[PDB]
Amino acid sequence: NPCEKHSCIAVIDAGSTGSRLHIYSYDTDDTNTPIHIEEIWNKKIKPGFASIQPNSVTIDAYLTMLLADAPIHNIPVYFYATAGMRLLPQSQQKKYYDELDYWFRQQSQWQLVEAKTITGNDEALFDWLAVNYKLDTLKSVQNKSVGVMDMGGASVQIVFPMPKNAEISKHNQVELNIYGQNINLYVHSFLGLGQTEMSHQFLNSPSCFANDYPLPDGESGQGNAPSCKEEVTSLMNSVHKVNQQIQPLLALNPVNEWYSIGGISNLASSQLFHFENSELTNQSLLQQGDNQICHQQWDILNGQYPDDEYLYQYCLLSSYYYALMVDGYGINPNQTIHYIPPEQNLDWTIGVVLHRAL
Amino acid sequence: NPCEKHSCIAVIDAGSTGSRLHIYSYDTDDTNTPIHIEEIWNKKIKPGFASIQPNSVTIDAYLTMLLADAPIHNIPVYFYATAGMRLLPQSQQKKYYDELDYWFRQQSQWQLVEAKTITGNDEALFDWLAVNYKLDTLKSVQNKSVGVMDMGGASVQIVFPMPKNAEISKHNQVELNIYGQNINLYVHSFLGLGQTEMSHQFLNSPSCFANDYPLPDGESGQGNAPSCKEEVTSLMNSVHKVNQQIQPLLALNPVNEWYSIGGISNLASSQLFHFENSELTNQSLLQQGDNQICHQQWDILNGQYPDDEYLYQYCLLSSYYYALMVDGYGINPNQTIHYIPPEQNLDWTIGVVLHRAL
Ligand SMILES: Nc1ncnc2c1ncn2[C@@H]1O[C@H](COP(=O)(O)O)[C@@H](O)[C@H]1O
Ligand code: MOO
Ligand code: MOO
Ligand SMILES: [Cl-]
Ligand SMILES: [Cl-]
Ligand SMILES: [Mg+2]
Ligand SMILES: [Mg+2]
Ligand SMILES: [Mg+2]
Ligand SMILES: [Mg+2]
Ligand SMILES: [Mg+2]
Ligand SMILES: [Mg+2]
Ligand code: NA
């Protein structure tokens, strides 16, 4: 039991598609900032917390499933929900938290510290701290600008270094001091642009699905990734103004290396796509989606790859990631995007471990 | 004892936000077409069928809650799911129907005829039949064109008379003969434009919420209906091409009387609004939304209208309806839109009772 000799906390990422519990052990440096962070337990359950009926029976079953078999308890718990809960009004979220608070008060194995819905800006902060912690880039001042994207089911986040600016909302800027360094970040979350919510605007777009895929309205798929990408870009830019907001900022604050977490890691590591070195380019991602999915005959392809419940969406998802990164953020189609291997189960929760001490 | 004296049928509207069972008694004319249709039972349960976990335990609980206390069980049942189920791929929908089929197989009274997801086109056909049945406009050749709109959670439908047009998809046209008359309709459904799905693209738009309403990203509402309306119009037109699809047909096939069903009845019946005769105009809805909700203080509104559960969305919905009807469909903003008093619970289910006899 590592928690007899080190500080441990539990952090639950309560996202739109499920909840992932992590238990972390760590030591602290002489500023009481965590160091030597190790994940000692990880469990994911489905569906998302926001998608269950908020009553005591259902919440008890859900929390028992998430927590009951953890090899360690008697530790502090942070339960932080993200865009799934942000899609609900505060009045509806309150019912979930009232029941969750009651569940924790009615037991003794867990010490609930906080249970709340965090803003997308906070989530973006945690995304950047978690990834940079993992890359070991937090220790000292960097030669390089490191940008992080988190591709979620309901929101997407982007975060990159930017000197503190009196022209940009305080909400979109975070200054931190960590390991004796001062770091100023631009943070942004686009609610509605996560893959599930985005996809609900394009399910009858033939260009977004393999040939003869049965669209819900009775028409047939006729896939073409550049065309599907153009459709998605209207949501990104005509509706959300992603390009107006992000591109002028990146033009002035070049990111040297991009890292992505979230769904893109699963897409890129699937049997349908082929990437080396856990990295992709948008050019290659679009081409692969276009040729390996959009221009294929659906029935034939479906029977060939029966083992992938995302298969049907791959023409759309490859098009959407390109529309987001290239047409939205302005990233060069040939720029390397590193993605964290899905086996790592890397999310923003290390950022919570780190941030409380800053 | 109506079903001892008349034919009876159960029709379930399994929509995105809940399922509504109706039991109708009816007689039939010389062609065996239903006449004298009377609702004898109505029960609504939440949440939507597509929102529950598709296992035997949860489906049993849901169908028992929907059906077990009905007064009459030995009748044909139609279970038709709409846009909530259309958001899911066929592979995922199959699990729901496999389990629901199993549940019906253990009932010795209910006679399951069909359980399936209907297309938005069929939903629109049933919309128009149900409303025109209630307006008593089906029995004879009409002087005036009656158009119908159904404002759902996940899709919206529009349907109106139009002679066969060999240049328009077969899927968007229906020809029926009912009560000795020949009717040709244009039908269209827009998946992703129902109020829940569309709202998920605008939750961080301050123009769309009352002053000081807490947005998910931590900024404050600063409502302005014309500004919110312009944002929603970008989703209507730049993304879904509503106007390009619909307006040319409506200019060539004008509608004299518009009837709406679905959510608009609930909005318009709020005490925040001043409407008479169960009708509204878009210009009145937008001006009233703008003045009494968008430009008012959230904390004040919330304490002032304790019975309006969805009050927080009223600025956005006033803007959204106008964006859809006026900027999308091209309806004049001073045109009367009749809505059905919500206490009638008029949905498209009477359409199924009529249609299956043709
Ligand atoms: N093969 C895949 N392709 C694309 N997205 C995926 C795939 N598998 C999972 N996802 C998405 O990845 C995110 C995290 O997945 P999970 O660990 O199942 O919560 C969700 O938004 C999923 O919808
Ligand atoms: O709650 Mo999310 O799935 O990270 O957008
Ligand atoms: O399933 Mo709907 O709520 O009528 O869009
Ligand atoms: Cl459809
Ligand atoms: Cl947010
Ligand atoms: Mg997430
Ligand atoms: Mg949803
Ligand atoms: Mg477009
Ligand atoms: Mg009988
Ligand atoms: Mg409906
Ligand atoms: Mg716009
Ligand atoms: Na949505």
Coordinates of C-alpha atoms and ligand atoms in Angstrom, one line a residue, chain A residues 13 123 150 348, ligand 6:
Chain A
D13 CA -12.9 12.6 -14.6
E123 CA -10.4 21.7 -18.0
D150 CA -8.2 17.6 -25.9
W348 CA -6.4 16.0 -17.5
Ligands
MG6 MG -12.7 14.5 -21.3

